[PDB]
Amino acid sequence: VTIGLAHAELIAVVTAITTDEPRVMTVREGAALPSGPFEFGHRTLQSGLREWIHEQTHHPVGYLEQLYTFADRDRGRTISIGYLGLVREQEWHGWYEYFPWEDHRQGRPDILDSIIDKLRAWADSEPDSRAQRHLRADFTFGLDWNEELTLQRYELLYEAGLVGEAQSPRINFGRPMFADHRRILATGIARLRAKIKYRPVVFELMADSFTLLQLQRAIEALAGLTLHKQNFRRLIEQQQLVEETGDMATAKLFRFRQTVLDERALSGTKLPLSRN
Amino acid sequence: TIGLAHAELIAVVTAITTDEPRVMTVREGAALPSGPFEFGHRTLQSGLREWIHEQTHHPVGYLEQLYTFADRNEILGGRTISIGYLGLVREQEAFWHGWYEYFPWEDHRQGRPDILDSIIDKLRAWADSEPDSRAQRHLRADFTFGLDGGGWNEELTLQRYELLYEAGLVGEAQSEPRINFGRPMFADHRRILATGIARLRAKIKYRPVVFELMADSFTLLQLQRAIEALAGLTLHKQNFRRLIEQQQLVEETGDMATETGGRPAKLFRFRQTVLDERALS
Incomplete structure (x- = not known):
């Protein structure tokens, strides 16, 4: 019997709200989320991630909920498991530093004009897939807006070579992160926005x-x-x-x-x- | 090397046939279609599609990821994890079995099933076996199986299965005297199936987009x-x-x-x- 093995990474998206700004726990001067391997000594996936959160931030964490599991997009394999947690800040970079096109509190940000243009140039680049790419871009990035489609927008930006993590003539919007941690963060943002649209159980974010x-x-x-x-x-x-x-x-x-x-x-x- | 794992990809492909929810199985209903994540698989999802095809040859449409479970054995060189996916299809001419063969306590269409009387009895005796855990185990038992006055919650399928497993009331837990309710499955596949049922029930309560199940x-x-x-x-x-x-x-x-009676x-x-x-x- 031959058994295939891969790197198992646990990745934490711990969000707080300070001065009406969504902040996310980061490490390495904001270049990455708290993360660490899944080891033999860890009882559960959650308890293993709580060990890495403690060692790397020393910040308390309440309830955690599993987000999504991704295989790497390099070119061995790596499997990343994300978790979401809500806290109040004790004793932090903002979401929109990494996803500036996702904050529409003061109308559509002007950065979307640059994003949409480069997105339609990509959609027009191959004629046989132009119609489908225009539909995807029209659905995800505004309408001809849905705040829940944060992951689908980032996936499309990645496919279009418009974020640094794609590593295409390097085009990039927002601050990039180590590996695919910005993909994890987009999953946490989308999960939290779906949670609050219908039942905002956010007592952990409030006093x-x-x-x-x-x-x-x-x-x-x-x-x-x-x-x-x-x-x-x-x-x-x-x-x-x-x-x-x-x-x-x-x-x-x-x-x-x-x-x-x-x-x-x-x-x-x-x-x-x-x-x- | 630290932090290595072996990942099994597990499919919960559901249809509705003769007004009964059914899941695609292999080995005459003993296991879900599953297979290991391999280096040549572009994504987790595309890997599972290769295993569903080789093992069932049944067409599959959209798939959504369910949840990732970890085991609980260091000779393997890593942990083992299970990644489930949920799909909806129409059944074709793979062995299809009904959901409620495996989870008979989850079907309350004709009233609360009688099996729940024996399940709750076994659950109460387990909650009372250890006094230092009696209170917390009873709260979990009343919440999961809807005895807390709030009523039956059809979405808590996974929380109910995990409590039965923790209490050794399903064969997969392998308790000191064997106690089991419902048809068991290979490995932890019923835990995956329970996750798929819970996910699907949360969907339909909010927005029943089930065009893949209907004609x-x-x-x-x-x-x-x-x-x-x-x-x-x-x-x-x-x-x-x-x-x-x-x-x-x-x-x-x-x-x-x-309609069968003649009603247009x-x-x-x-x-x-x-x-x-x-x-x-």
């Missing part, structure tokens, strides 16, 4: 007490969008996520109900998930 | 029966038809079908935009 304005501003920071104010508030009351603390702030203060906190405690790292 | 044209009753089979629950007819209309998932084809019903199809979105993802 115990918060106003509905602050809760909206932090969701808006994660989504990279401005949300209809009254639509967000009725979505919150619909999902029965928060309750008022009885105290005030200068606006009412709220906190996530204990039923929300306990259900997370009995769920694990593989949540019943809507889709990719 | 090209279908009635609304046929679509409802398909969703009910996946969920293991009977649907609220009006809420269901309200859901797919607000999602704008289907459209009238213009043709009519004649309009045929429907999933809209082309729905097909296009899934392609461009």
